[PDB]
């Protein structure tokens, strides 16, 4: 798939085409929708530029256009070779979500008293 976090950026309208069952499911869908911009934002922030403007410029562009943080330019990602494995992206997303959504269900935390 496309590299630079653009592959997760192109799946936001798939979440926009979802009908939640209730308000809490809608909250979770919005959480994932806001999370989907995080890798591209982090890559752009590590390059010294403002990641939100870069992310908005990526979503306002065509589906083949992403941000090259090395050259700092908006390019064709397949033609420039900036590509990612699909397995890596889905594995990272699923493994992050499964533990973080379970962590957010907590009300009580029990720890050992430090000796």
Ligand X SMILES: Nc1ncnc2c1ncn2[C@@H]1O[C@H](COP(=O)(O)OP(=O)(O)OP(=O)(O)O)[C@@H](O)[C@H]1O
Dist. CA 2–CA 78, nearest whole Å = 7
Tell me the closest approach of the beta carbon of residue 93 to ligand X, in angstroms: 11
2 three-state secondary structure: strand
Q: Is 95 one of the binding residues for a second copy (CB under 8 A)? A: no
The conformation of residue 113, written as its DSSP 8-state character, comes to P
Q: Is 52 one of the binding residues for a second copy (CB under 8 A)? A: yes
Q: Is 55 one of the binding residues for ligand X (CB under 6 A)? A: no
Binding residues for a second copy restricted to 53-92, rule: CB under 8 A: 53, 56
Q: Report DSSP letters for 51-83, one per residue.
A: HHHHHHHHHTS-TTEEEETTTTEEEETTTTT-B
Q: Is 65 one of the binding residues for ligand X (CB under 6 A)? A: no
Residues lying near ligand X in the complex (CB under 6 A) are found at 3-5, 39, 43, 67-70, 82, 84
């Amino acid at each position: 798939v496309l590299g630079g976090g653009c592959a997760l950026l192109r799946c936001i309208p798939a979440l926009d085409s979802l009908t939640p069952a209730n308000e809490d499911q809608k909250i979770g869908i919005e959480i994932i929708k806001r999370t989907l911009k995080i890798p591209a934002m982090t890559i752009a922030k590590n390059a010294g530029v403002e990641g939100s403007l870069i992310v908005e410029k990526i979503m306002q562009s065509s589906s083949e256009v992403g941000y090259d943080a090395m050259a700092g330019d908006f390019v064709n990602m397949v033609e420039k070779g900036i590509i990612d494995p699909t397995k890596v992206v889905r594995t990272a997303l699923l493994d992050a979500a499964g533990v973080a959504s379970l962590l957010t269900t907590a009300e009580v935390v029990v720890t050992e008293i430090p000796k």
